[PDB]
Swiss-Prot record, chain B:
<feature type="short sequence motif" description="Selectivity filter">
    <location>
        <begin position="127"/>
        <end position="129"/>
    </location>
</feature>
<feature type="intramembrane region" description="Pore-forming">
    <location>
        <begin position="113"/>
        <end position="153"/>
    </location>
</feature>
<feature type="transmembrane region" description="Helical; Name=3">
    <location>
        <begin position="16"/>
        <end position="34"/>
    </location>
</feature>
<feature type="transmembrane region" description="Helical; Name=4">
    <location>
        <begin position="42"/>
        <end position="64"/>
    </location>
</feature>
<feature type="topological domain" description="Extracellular">
    <location>
        <begin position="104"/>
        <end position="112"/>
    </location>
</feature>
<comment type="function">
    <text>Monovalent cation-selective ion channel activated by intracellular Ca(2+) in a voltage- and temperature-dependent manner. Mediates the transport of Na(+), K(+) and Cs(+) ions equally well. Activated directly by increase in intracellular Ca(2+), but is impermeable to it. The activation mechanism of TRPM5 involves a multistep process.</text>
</comment>
<feature type="topological domain" description="Extracellular">
    <location>
        <begin position="154"/>
        <end position="165"/>
    </location>
</feature>
<comment type="similarity">
    <text>Belongs to the transient receptor (TC 1.A.4) family. LTrpC subfamily. TRPM5 sub-subfamily.</text>
</comment>
<feature type="binding site">
    <location>
        <position position="17"/>
    </location>
    <ligand>
        <name>Ca(2+) 2</name>
    </ligand>
</feature>
<feature type="transmembrane region" description="Helical; Name=6">
    <location>
        <begin position="166"/>
        <end position="200"/>
    </location>
</feature>
<feature type="binding site">
    <location>
        <position position="20"/>
    </location>
    <ligand>
        <name>Ca(2+) 2</name>
    </ligand>
</feature>
<feature type="topological domain" description="Extracellular">
    <location>
        <begin position="35"/>
        <end position="41"/>
    </location>
</feature>
<feature type="topological domain" description="Cytoplasmic">
    <location>
        <begin position="1"/>
        <end position="15"/>
    </location>
</feature>
<feature type="transmembrane region" description="Helical; Name=5">
    <location>
        <begin position="74"/>
        <end position="103"/>
    </location>
</feature>
<comment type="subunit">
    <text>Homotetramer.</text>
</comment>
<feature type="binding site">
    <location>
        <position position="217"/>
    </location>
    <ligand>
        <name>Ca(2+) 2</name>
    </ligand>
</feature>
<feature type="topological domain" description="Cytoplasmic">
    <location>
        <begin position="65"/>
        <end position="73"/>
    </location>
</feature>
Length: 622, 309
């Protein structure tokens, strides 16, 4: 059977129409068909499968069958194995999908697409057995194993395989498909991390010490020395020195560390403006440093907006806004900029000067917190950020327990001790603020123990109490109960809850750390991708680069590259050969397994037993 | 026989040797400043620091102890988690301290007190030092305070704290206390627990490897402890001017005997490995399967011959 001649487009649609009618794919196709009929030979048309693929991927299967709108029904498919694998995958048939993937031209991209589609359908699965099978598709495992084989083979063609534009999947980079699939374990592979590190250091050698890099950064002229080694490959000399300067200062790591240094400068300047150079309203004029800070933040917001929106040529504005607001750190950035605007506006007035100063004080905290997200890319710090983000849940559980116990104890003690205090502020104080401070060693017995209560001048009258003429006298009717309750509260809170939280953090750390490392690598990929297009000038200078980019756009990538046809075909054949070798190795290891050998031995011993029994009967006949 | 520059590099490579260099440099500087009168107090201060440096040297001295050395290695490994916690705490503390200093004392020009209220006090908040008398208006004392900057700078009266939005200051103090004194500290405890569990086994081996070198050093060390050691040094110098249990050289016959014994033991070890490989379950399964295939084909031929008769 010749699949290339067997699989025509009409035959493919015939296969798609003959779905089992009891699986998820049939329900999705029916939904699409009803939608198309409402918007208005074969039960399902290629429009329905195209829309299903649009739901599942939304960028890859564009023009797979719409290009010609349907193609010639008798014309054979250009990519038969790709279509067969896609078809077998949409209906949770994994054994067949596996066989088709073993025959496809591009296997890593196919495996990543398969795992993406499986994890997308896992949510839509109705039956628990189907969902369980879908969650164990291990198609990402196939991609990782095949890429491990490829990386062990060449380690130089593997990077080209990662960064090339696949022909079968609409010029989609393998890394792009992995990002779409959110294949975290694939990015955790050593080869992908090595490629990302190579991108990270730019022209410099990846083994360069951090101290040498920092020293060279702080003293620019040392770039032309031999302090840092570079990877190989009047007018000429000037070109050489300019090339060296650019190759050093265009490296993503240098851009990152410059951004960090200038963000530290921003925090220093913000603190100085807020603490020493905060002047009266514009009638007396905001300080020049305050204007510099305003310009600084304007440049920062410009960079944020450019990175979030102007990086992509074609995408819906509403979709881009939703994607931006999806991230929590972007919500923190929005809070920061809103606080900055409100504080500046209130500062410009005189009746709201103090409110503006307060809002700017809060904004400094927000920016200093933004610093953590800035440092997220650090090799030693990022996993810690992930771990803390996971610890937040145990923090919330402890908060629930502590809140219940604290409400109880505080309200009871406020009732027992100050039953005649009408002041709501002081009621809430003695009910919640003081018991909360009891946790941190702040136990003011002068207001709780009669033997320790001072002979201060106190009143019992409510009127005088409200006016604040004298502090309200504490009730000492049953103070033994108050002291006993304080003892029990101290025990419970300061021992049981705190040590329980310590145990929870220990367990959570042990269970989470390994996943946190993989998640850090997966996020590191995206951070390096972002640093690719980021201008090499850190803020507030970044305005020069923004103006230059705007002027160039008005007048007029190491990752995700496109290769010549000959090299592309060579790499495709090399991938196919490596896939064949990997499958042969798996099959050979299966044959030599102890269980397979036992099965073979048992079957052959049974056959030998019956045959030699016949032979012995023949011998006894003689 | 070794290059002087190479020996100097090898010496300065070790961190404890760097600590020793710091100690001796501090001793020299303190003695020099003590010899003068205008720098007497500075010399006393430098010697005070040097005492701390020597008392820290005591740990490296005790490193060879059988029960203490692995603990030294473990602490040296814990330093990294200490640094991670330091980064987190530094970021959070800078944020909270600068914000509270802005909210509470917006008119204090004194840089020393700005840095105090911004970093020293929030740092002490970790260790149960929470002076609410300067943070809560209901707890702020009726002390004699000034608002004027001039008088503030001269130190005539302490600067009055701002109480515009003190609910925000108390809320920020509550959040800072929660985060720092709970999340960061218990996270560091968990990090130390995990690091201890993962590191202890390697720390023991590293302790043994270092113990070898320490015993090698103690081999040639004179038996007289300092300050007496000068007698041994003078004796050694005089002997050098006038004129080992480990790393010994053996006679030719004994050397050849030990070489042949080593070869025999190596042959025995290799034979044991090969024998254990032959008797392994996997090798037995492979042998059985191959012999069963051969027996199958051969007995099939035999049965064909028998059926021919
Ligand atoms: C292992 C475990 C640990 C936890 C716990 O169980 C065991 O420990 C138990 C110990 C127990 C506590 C043991 C003892 C007591 C005392 C008792 O009062 C005795 C009754 C009398 C009658 O009102 C009160 O006395 C007097 O009050 C007056 C207040 O008007 C004071 O006037 C003051 O006025 C001025 C103050 O400004 C100044 O002039 C002086 O300062 C002073 O003159 C007197 O000086 C003082 O004599 C109440 C109960 C209490 C606190 C126990 C509570 C429970 C424990 C903590 C147990 C734990 C479970
Ligand atoms: C479970 C969890 C724990 C954490 C938390 O959430 C829940 O707890 C919440 C509790 C809450 C707090 C609850 C209550 C309050 C009070 C409120 O002020 C009310 C407004 C008024 C208006 O300015 C202020 O009042 C007055 O100020 C004056 C200062 O000029 C005082 O004058 C003093 O002058 C002299 C002082 O030397 C002396 O004569 C006397 O000492 C006294 O006369 C008055 O006495 C006092 O009446 C501000 C907010 C605050 C602190 C809450 C903050 C947030 C919490 C901690 C929550 C946590 C998240
Ligand atoms: C963590 C929660 C947040 C929300 C809340 O409880 C803790 O905060 C508390 C702070 C309280 C304030 C504190 C001070 C004053 C001033 C006083 O003249 C009148 C009453 C009022 C407004 C109080 C009303 C009730 C409030 C909001 C409490 C509220 C349930
Ligand atoms: C852990 C870091 C070390 C470095 C540093 O921050 C913490 O130490 C702080 C101590 C500060 C000092 C403390 C006291 C005074 C006296 C005062 O009349 C003039 C200002 C000056 C010199 C301050 C300048 C800024 C200094 C060095 C801060 C500096 C960023
Ligand atoms: C309390 O107030 C009264 C008012 O007359 C006064 O006589 C008395 O001395 C005051 N005591 C204290 C401790 O202030
Ligand atoms: C504060 O200083 C003034 C100066 O006249 C003085 O009259 C007043 O008694 C002082 N108050 C305190 C509490 O020292």
């Amino acid at each position: 059977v010749n699949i290339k001649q067997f699989l025509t487009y009409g035959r493919l649609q015939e296969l798609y129409c003959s779905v089992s009618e009891k699986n998820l794919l049939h329900t999705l196709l029916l939904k699409k068909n009803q939608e198309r009929q409402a918007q208005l030979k074969f039960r399902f048309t290629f429009h329905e499968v195209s829309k299903v693929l649009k739901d599942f991927l939304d960028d890859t299967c564009k023009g797979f069958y719409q290009k010609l709108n349907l193609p010639d029904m008798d014309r054979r498919c250009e990519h038969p194995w790709r279509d067969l694998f896609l078809w077998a995958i949409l209906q949770n048939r994994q054994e067949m999908a596996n066989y088709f993937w073993a025959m496809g031209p591009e296997a890593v991209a196919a495996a990543l697409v398969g795992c993406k589609i499986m994890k997308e359908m896992a949510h839509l699965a109705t039956e628990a057995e189907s969902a369980r099978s879908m969650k164990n598709a291990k198609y990402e495992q196939f991609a990782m194993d095949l890429f491990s084989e490829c990386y062990s083979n060449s380690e130089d063609r593997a990077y080209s395989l990662l960064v090339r534009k696949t022909c079968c999947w609409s010029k989609a980079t393998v890394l792009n498909i992995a990002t779409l699939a959110e294949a975290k374990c694939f990015f955790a592979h050593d080869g992908v991390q090595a490629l990302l590190t190579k991108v990270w250091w730019g022209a410099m050698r990846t083994d360069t010490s951090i101290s040498r890099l920092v020293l060279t950064f702080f003293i620019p002229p040392l770039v032309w020395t031999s302090l840092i080694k570079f990877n190989p490959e009047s007018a000429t000399f000037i070109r050489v020195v300019l090339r060296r300067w650019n190759r050093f200062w265009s490296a993503p790591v240098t851009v990152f560390m410059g951004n960090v240094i200038m963000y530290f400068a921003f925090l220093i300047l913000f603190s100085y403006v807020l603490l020493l150079d905060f002047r009266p309203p514009p009638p007396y004029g905001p300080s020049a440093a305050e204007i510099i800070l305003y310009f600084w933040v304007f440049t920062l917001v410009l960079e944020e907006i450019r990175q979030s929106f102007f990086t992509d040529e074609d995408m819906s504005i509403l979709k881009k806004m939703k994607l931006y607001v999806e991230d929590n750190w972007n919500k923190c950035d929005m809070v920061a900029i809103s606080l900055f605007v409100v504080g500046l506006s209130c500062r410009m007035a005189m009746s709201t000067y103090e409110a503006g100063r307060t809002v700017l004080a809060l904004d400094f905290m927000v920016f200093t917190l933004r610093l953590i997200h800035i440092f997220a890319i650090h090799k030693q710090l990022g996993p810690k950020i992930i771990i803390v983000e996971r610890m937040i849940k145990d923090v919330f559980f402890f908060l629930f327990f502590l809140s219940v116990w604290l409400i109880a104890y505080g309200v009871t003690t406020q009732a027992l001790l100050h039953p005649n205090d009408p002041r709501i502020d002081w009621v809430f104080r003695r009910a919640l603020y003081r018991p909360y401070l009891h946790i941190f060693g702040q136990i003011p017995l002068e207001e709780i123990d009669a033997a320790k209560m001072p002979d201060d001048n106190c009143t019992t009258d409510v009127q005088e109490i409200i006016l604040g003429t004298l502090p309200p006298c504490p009730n000492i009717y049953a103070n033994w109960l108050v002291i006993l309750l304080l003892v029990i509260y101290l025990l419970v809170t300061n021992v049981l809850l705190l040590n329980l939280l310590i145990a929870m953090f220990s367990y959570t750390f042990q269970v989470v750390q390994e996943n946190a490392d993989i998640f850090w690598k997966f996020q590191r990929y995206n951070l390096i991708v972002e640093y690719h297009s980021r201008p090499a000038l850190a803020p507030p200078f970044i305005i020069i680069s923004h103006i230059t980019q705007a002027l160039l756009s008005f007048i007029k990538d190491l990752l995700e590259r496109e290769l010549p046809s000959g090299l592309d075909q060579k790499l495709m054949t090399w991938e196919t050969v490596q896939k064949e070798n990997y499958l042969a190795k798996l099959e050979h290891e299966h044959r030599e397994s102890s269980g397979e050998r036992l099965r073979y031995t048992s079957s052959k011993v049974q056959t030998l037993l019956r045959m030699v029994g016949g032979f012995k009967d023949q011998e006894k006949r003689m």
